[PDB]
From a paper:
Herpesvirus glycoprotein B (gB) is a structurally conserved, class III membrane fusion protein, composed of α- and β-secondary structure elements, that combines structural features characteristic of class I and II fusion proteins. Membrane merging is achieved via substantial structural rearrangements of these proteins from a metastable pre- to a stable postfusion conformation. Cell entry of enveloped viruses requires specialized viral proteins that mediate fusion with the host membrane by substantial structural rearrangements from a metastable pre- to a stable postfusion conformation. This metastability renders the herpes simplex virus 1 (HSV-1) fusion glycoprotein B (gB) highly unstable such that it readily converts into the postfusion form, thereby precluding structural elucidation of the pharmacologically relevant prefusion conformation. All four glycoproteins are essential and sufficient for HSV-1 membrane fusion and entry.
Here, by using a molecular dynamics (MD) simulations and sequence-structure analysis guided mutational approach, we successfully trapped the prefusion conformation of gB and determined its structure to sub-nanometer resolution by electron cryo tomography (cryo-ET) and sub-volume averaging (SVA). For this, we introduced helix-breaking point mutations to proline into the MD-predicted helix hinge at residues 515 to 517 of gB. This proline scanning resulted in wild type (WT)–like expression of full-length mutant gB only with a proline at position 516. Compared to wt gB, the cell-cell fusion activity of gB H516P was reduced to 6.5% (SD: 3.2%), only slightly above the background level [1.6% (SD: 1.4%)] of a fusion-null construct. This fusion inhibition is consistent with a block in the pre- to postfusion state transition, functionally locking the protein. For gB H516P, total vesicle production was similar to wt gB, but the ratio was drastically shifted to 98.2% (n = 112) of vesicles displaying solely the compact form and only 1.8% displaying the extended form (n = 2), with comparable size distributions as the wt vesicles (x~ Ø = 53 nm for extended form; x~ Ø = 90 nm for compact form). The order of fitting the individual domains is depicted in movie S2 starting with DIV (orange), which forms the crown domain in the postfusion conformation. This domain showed the best fit being docked upside down, in relation to the membrane, into a fist-shaped density, located about 2 nm from the membrane. DI (blue) was fitted in the leg density, connected to DII and leading to the membrane, localizing the fusion loops pointing toward the membrane. The domain arrangement resulting from our domain fitting of gB resembles that of VSV-G in its prefusion conformation, although in gB, DIV is cyclically swapped within the trimer, making contacts with neighboring protomer subunits, while for the CD of VSV-G, such domain swapping does not occur (top views).
Author numbering:
A (entry chain A), B (entry chain C), C (entry chain B): 104 to 476, 491 to 723
The structure:
């Protein structure tokens, strides 16, 4: 049956090719300590430029060619070679054989390091073949292939003999560049360092390049050939064809598309505390818990594009801050004040003062704006409690800023604590880590010390269909890891086989097994509920709020009996050990690493 | 052995064996974005639907058979069969051979392939065998076995030759029905699907039936032979005997045991705002962090039972909340309101009102009570401050509600972080995670994405005895991993063999070996103290205050111990590398997995 | 390239051994909310005895010997032995061959099998050898060794054939006796008793000995020859020598080194509450997260040594606390009062009063110092209101105490929330755990249920070089997984081979290979930024001033590159699944076991 638990739409999890420019920054030293660094409270809005990730679509053009140095001995066959290589599809195969025809020859005539080389299909000659959707062309902006074969050259022994195979790959994919637009990403796992807007039109070819004009072939008037149709489409596209050393990329060309007003605010933070310390303005935000330790001077509208737009932005920002929380809570201090953290972090900072000691407006005004870049006839200031309450201001400055430092280092340790927590979190499930941190459905994975970022093909909780056959026995009795599922993009989507992943993840896996431990009784997150299989067969579903339908309740003292039946045996059934027998998943690992210790010992005399 | 510091009793790792499958709420969806919804605050009290597990005792009965279809070669032999099957011990063997005799024949007689096959013991015929303790326990009325090994027939080659072995299995258990009492969980590992009050008397035919009338023999007034004494130690018991298709249950029969207050006060949350939104109200709890999107109308005391006791419980809860935090803090706003969060959460909610512009009593409750389910002259109202204060009501409500929304966003993101955290936390240690989230000392394990529960027995240390020398001698060089213990369920119980798990855990199995790591010096929590084994030999315990728990005059950061060369295997040996040195469990896995790379099973010509 | 992202200093990975000095404690059950009470608000000041552990230098002396009992049969050669030992260099060879010469014979004369055996070099007679400094000439005090030499006995088959080799080792290192000074711990991973102040003079003889005076060799005016140069150094020094059973220690000797003032303020805790409960005072701090159950009376200046300095320090702590928060926040009542949180935690207290009923000072100081260790005249308290308010004070006591208890329980969870997780945090990150609790240091590890520490590492944090060789060919073509790095202890130190673990860490190992994931593009945490290799070829660094992290402005929610076919691909190419994903990372770890889970036997004729 198709999925019914509509309380949570599924996640497609194909391995992503991240960038990644978003990673957990290394935690920070904890901030400054005792008194006056003229700790100054105020609302800052911190900005950077817009990175303008121009999006479009392109298509990849190459031909993977493989040769098998089969080793024909006496009666035996060593594959002394099965070598495969991507080889850039020529402009001509695109224009005619693909764009006009939609096919690719069973021979590939390709470049390889200044040497033109040909490859054929099965010790025989050329044949155009249709680009059926590639192997693993699903789950992505599709690709198209021709076969899934390997050929063995006709048998002649006592010599390394080579059998050939040629296949085409022409693939519609999505594409992302960014300002400063001298680069772009490729939706197969590739990147090219050339300016995205480089077509010969409008002078956008005068824009950056990092390559020569011997592989860029701009067909304006091109006809976008839908590779799901292998047939042309709507009014002519300007497809640029960059014949890379491995493929060709054809893409809609567009003008340079600059970005103004590019300055885009990181954050508004009212809890913006100034520490004039270490020859530096130390801006502490407890909203994001960062001390930008920047230069003293200010940052002008001149070092940015249209500083007036950001002036509007920040004025409205600070208004939203104050009016909502501080109608009668603080007093505006001076102007917003602009500070550059290297890497272009802009701080616009309207200092604020607490209503403590309300007698010091015009005066603490001056004293703390001091940092932007006998016989007598009484002549005291019109209320010497101006000066008196200034001395009291300095007094208060002492404990107030001391408290600020203390609570700020509290914030420091809190955030530095959780930083590594989230490191281990993305170690666990970076898909979920994204589905929270950006909050959206996503395909992710951990690339060592960096992550892989993407978004997956949509599947709601009605397109997937669990299988009930839950084992492979060619390897005698190997039950699959997580529910085998036939699913589809839409009702017209391709019903394709994979395994469920944890929390509605849809991995294409259809070999993901592990031994069939008797005693299998497993829930699995199924849409907005759970599937449940008993001993590798489907028992039943259960909605999330339908299993006891409460959260943190109960006692909860449930008992059980001891070492039990369900008996594959010689003594004291073993298949529950094959269900992690205490063990202690972690100790499961800690014991199975004791098995390497035996891979010898058929090879010794004493 | 009892330690110098033992206040932590010892919870000796009995993993669940079968039931149960307790479910766990998914991370609640994190909230929305901008303002107005009425957001009307006050106390909520959620009732749960009285669900309760009935508890009583039962006992299980089945003979298993093992057969050896040996094929004998010339002097060699293949086991063309070692087959083990289970057979419910029928009514009569319980009544006589068990209740009257406590003994079990050496033949097991059971249907198989639709044919009743008999099995003997040792190719020799029926013989009643003592129920010998299949284990040693103190909690769920443990059971008894009869044999350990299987038999092989004489040598007759070139034809499948068969030798037989029969075993009996009789084991008492605790039994846990659950409201609404139609099926019940067991202790051995099976689940039975009959009503608990089901039987033959007091209209128990109306009780949930899902089994035929040929296996259930309600032999009541029928003595239960205490087989921990192998003797009837009871009044003649109300036993019901279901010869289930795989086993036999004999259990106390009880009248129908329902209870009367259908809703049970499950939660209280003073942070209860009505977010008037989405064709609905959303009861938003910033104490247990929910937003139930319930209809505007309320669940009546009519469509659930006892609409008075529940209401009184809620009234008392609300009075408690008020008196505990609001003797003069908020305003009694309207009546409480009694909504069904789908699946059966009862939400009784007495609204509140802060003293923010406290000059709107008679009206504003009135106002929000909107949401439970020619010649001329001057005539002003009695105090148009009514209308002025209502204008202000709306206008301050707006940003107030926004602030509530945002603090709730913080609420949700935090809770959803923590959920995923606990996921891997229980995958590391479900014992600790569960046992503390519940308070009970229990043993849990992974059923895919949920937990299985079994309560551990807090024992004293002296029952448990870590031996001094630990190592496996299969091949020289493997000193056991976790502290081998001779322990006792009772004070004078059987000292049985297991291994100490982490921190009063006792992994019952003993196969966990490790490098006899030359320089191995490891503590393990022993009560409130720590046991020491230097190179897998016991020195001493140390209290946690002697191993120097958290300090401040240290950290200040004086240096500590460090390590240098030793004299196996030039510069120092591998014995310590394999002691999970560093390692770094993550590093442990990432390296040790490379043993596929450390695997070469191929020796051919190329 | 040398380490240039040194916005984070780099740290080599040493082998840690710990106690630990700031040790993980276990979460605890937390007691009563409402009952036995009159919580005592006010400061406490916990003292803990500063032992002031002695830190100084020493030197280890031994000769590691090896004898190979090769097994020479027909023509083949098994090793019926490679026997490897440390023989303590005699105090004499230190005196002259090492301190006067710096040399030491190729032979060690030491007991084995209760037989004073000899060990020579290469089946020929004795010769002196030079102690060339090892890698242990750094990372502690200096150290000296010889090259990795081994000899195989002459060829005489059909008899156990024996060949010898002996290598000398002198290793000065850093040493830590800890007060109460009956002992001292070593830099090699060794402990010994017999307090190091065992010199004959100053009366230090009474200072603890655990070992007979047979091997205490006090040579005053005994310099330590610079063994990096075999030249006199360390102007003649009071060196005491213990020819331990494995080595000899030579260490500077000092007077007793007392530790007054021992008892030292652990912390000053503002929020402190006394629940006079369970026949005890329970001191609760939601200010430093503790719940001790301490003694009721006051630990006098007498029951511990020198308790006056403590009193001064506590006066200081208390006045600082008041001034920092309580100029007008609470009411002082009562003295400081001592309390023994057993295990050696002192608790001075200065009780407070909330400003609730600010009129009852004179009364309340009495009422709660009650718990330290007709013609009528209206005769009331000075104002009967005092007797009036004393009433509600009681009726204030419990509910307040209730809240006091109540909130604490919340705190309880929070505290009890995270303890074990920190333990699991190290399971990934002794790096992070140490760089937080230690602060900048690294290298902890898990010895059973205890932590292990090493804080000495001197690093040329500028000289760290990721190798541009990214493979091993032993397993033909195995790309190394973690960044191989040439580094050095000092700016001119030897660039030595190791592997760049995460975050400024250089493990001494280089074996971590992997199958070359085509398309490899990997950062690894490299100090002030990351290192990047592109398909196992150095791409570039990136400092952390330019690469994003989770924030608001332009999303930063988009998809990135997707994976597709590459050219190792028939189906499921190994090289790329290497990148920790198919999956379901945890299932990655699981299938990592699947390999033993399908094969250990090759053949058997059924």
């Amino acid at each position: 049956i198709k999925a019914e638990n509509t309380d949570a739409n599924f996640y497609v999890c194909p391995p992503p090719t991240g960038a990644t420019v978003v990673q957990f920054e290394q935690p920070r030293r904890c901030p400054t300590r005792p008194e006056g660094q003229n700790y100054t409270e105020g609302i800052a809005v911190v900005f950077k430029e817009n990175i303008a990730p121009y999006k479009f679509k392109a298509t990849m053009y190459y031909k993977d060619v493989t040769v098998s140095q089969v080793w024909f001995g006496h009666r035996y066959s060593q594959f002394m070679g099965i070598f495969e290589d991507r080889a850039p599809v020529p402009f001509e195969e695109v224009i005619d054989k693909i764009n006009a025809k939609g096919v690719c020859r069973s021979t590939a005539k390709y470049v390889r390091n200044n040497l033109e080389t040909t490859a054929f299909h099965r010790d025989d000659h050329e044949t155009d073949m249709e680009l059926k959707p590639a192997n693993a062309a699903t789950r992505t902006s599709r690709g198209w292939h021709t076969t899934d074969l390997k050929y063995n050259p006709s048998r002649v022994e006592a010599f390394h003999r080579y059998g050939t195979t040629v296949n085409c790959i022409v693939e519609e994919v999505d594409a992302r560049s960014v300002y400063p637009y001298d680069e772009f990403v490729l939706a197969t796992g590739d990147f090219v360092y050339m300016s995205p807007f480089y077509g010969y039109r409008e002078g956008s070819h005068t824009e950056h390049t990092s390559y020569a004009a011997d592989r860029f072939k701009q067909v304006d008037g091109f006809y976008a050939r839908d590779l799901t149709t292998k047939a042309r489409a709507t009014a002519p596209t300007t497809r640029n064809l960059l014949t890379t050393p491995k493929f060709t990329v054809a893409w809609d060309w567009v003008p340079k598309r600059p970005s103004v007003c590019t300055m885009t605010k990181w954050q508004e933070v009212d809890e913006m505390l100034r520490s004039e310390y270490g020859g530096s303005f130390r801006f502490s935000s407890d909203a994001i818990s960062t001390t930008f330790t920047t230069n003293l001077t200010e940052y002008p509208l001149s070092r940015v594009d249209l500083g007036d737009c950001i002036g509007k932005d920040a004025r409205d920002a600070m208004d939203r801050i104050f009016a909502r929380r501080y109608n009668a809570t603080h007093i505006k201090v001076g102007q917003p004040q602009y500070y550059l953290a290297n890497g272009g972090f802009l701080i616009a900072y309207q200092p604020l003062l607490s209503n403590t000691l309300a007698e010091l407006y015009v005066r603490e005004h001056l004293r703390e704006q001091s940092r932007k870049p006998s016989v007598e006839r009484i002549k005291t200031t019109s209320s010497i409690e101006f000066a008196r309450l200034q001395f009291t201001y300095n007094h208060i400055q002492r404990p107030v800023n001391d408290m600020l430092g203390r609570v700020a280092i509290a914030w420091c340790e809190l955030q530095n604590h959780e930083l590594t927590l989230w490191n281990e979190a993305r170690k666990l499930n970076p898909n979920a880590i994204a589905s929270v941190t950006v909050g959206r459905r996503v395909s992710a994975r951990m690339l060592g010390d960096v992550m892989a970022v993407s978004t997956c093909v949509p599947v709601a909780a009605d397109n997937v269909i669990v299988q009930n056959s839950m084992r492979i026995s060619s390897r005698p009795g190997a039950c699959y890891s997580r529910p085998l599922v036939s699913f589809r993009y839409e009702d017209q989507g391709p019903l394709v086989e994979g395994q469920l992943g944890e929390n509605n993840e849809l991995r294409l896996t259809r070999d993901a097994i592990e031994p069939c431990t008797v005693g299998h009784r497993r829930y699995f997150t199924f849409g907005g509920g759970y599937v449940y299989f008993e001993e590798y067969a489907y028992s039943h579903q259960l909605s999330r709020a339908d299993i006891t339908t409460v959260s943190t309740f109960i006692d909860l003292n449930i008992t059980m009996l001891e070492d039990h039946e369900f008996v594959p045996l010689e003594v004291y059934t073993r298949h529950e050990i094959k269900d992690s027998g205490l063990l202690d998943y972690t100790e499961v690992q800690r014991r199975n690493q004791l098995h390497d210790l035996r891979f010898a010992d058929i090879d010794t005399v004493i």
